[PDB]
Design a protein around this ligand. Structure first.
Ligand SMILES: *CCC(=O)N1CC[C@@H](C2=NC(=O)c3cc(-c4c(O)cccc4F)ncc3C2)C1
Ligand SMILES: Nc1nc2c(ncn2[C@@H]2O[C@H](COP(=O)(O)OP(=O)(O)O)[C@@H](O)[C@H]2O)c(=O)[nH]1
Ligand SMILES: [Mg+2]
Length: 170
């Protein structure tokens, strides 16, 4: 059989949400993708031997209220919290995005994975250890990625699927 998963990618403008999504959907690095386009994308993959259909909302547009975004967030099963390892403000924004998720959710137990993207860049400003502290404080996994080299991309999405499976077993 197959399982479907409704996933959401959140984070500050410019962290690589679209690049990560496109690495998962199309298996290469798209370095110019309209920063304003918010859409959902479907890809069938195989995770731990089970056919898995991932529907992924790549958040974008503006900070102003979008009902369609809200309705997708309210029903999302798992969230990638993406920052860029060369952008301290994007890391400090993670708290805000997690609070926003918890607010549109009734459950206190929402599957999430913290994702530190752009791991290929030498100009690092956020230490892996600072991100591990924050993920531990939330009780979620931390995954390092590069949408440029594809390092960690399957790890981020498939770890979120494994967290959703654990949630569904409760
Ligand atoms: C380059 C432009 C870009 O990528 N953005 C501009 C707006 C930014 C944005 N990121 C989010 O992650 C986000 C999340 C949420 C949200 C809402 O509305 C409800 C529950 C949980 C949430 F995370 N709202 C807005 C935004 C905006 C991305
Ligand atoms: N070096 C590097 N650049 C990246 C990576 N991910 C995204 N980018 C670049 O970062 C910028 C923002 O990426 P984008 O996918 O538009 O971010 P979004 O606003 O979160 O959708 C673009 O110039 C991308 O080419 C990455 O892992 N490494
Ligand atoms: Mg984008």
């Amino acid at each position: 059989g197959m399982t479907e998963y409704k996933l959401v990618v959140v984070g500050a403008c410019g962290v690589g949400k679209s690049a990560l999504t496109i690495q998962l959907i199309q298996n290469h690095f798209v370095d110019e993708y309209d920063p304003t386009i918010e859409d959902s994308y479907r890809k069938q993959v195989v995770i731990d031997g089970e056919t898995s259909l991932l529907d992924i909302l790549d958040t974008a547009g503006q900070e102003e209220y979008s009902a369609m975004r809200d309705q997708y967030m309210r029903t999302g099963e798992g969230f990638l919290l993406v920052f860029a390892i060369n952008n301290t403000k994007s890391f400090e924004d993670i708290h805000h995005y997690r609070e926003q998720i918890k607010r549109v959710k009734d459950s206190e137990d929402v599957p999430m994975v913290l994702v530190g993207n752009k791991s290929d860049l030498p100009s690092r400003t956020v230490d892996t250890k600072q991100a591990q502290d924050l993920a531990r404080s939330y009780g979620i996994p931390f995954i390092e990625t590069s949408a440029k080299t594809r390092q960690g991309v399957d790890d981020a999405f498939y770890t979120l699927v494994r967290e959703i499976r654990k949630h569904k077993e409760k």
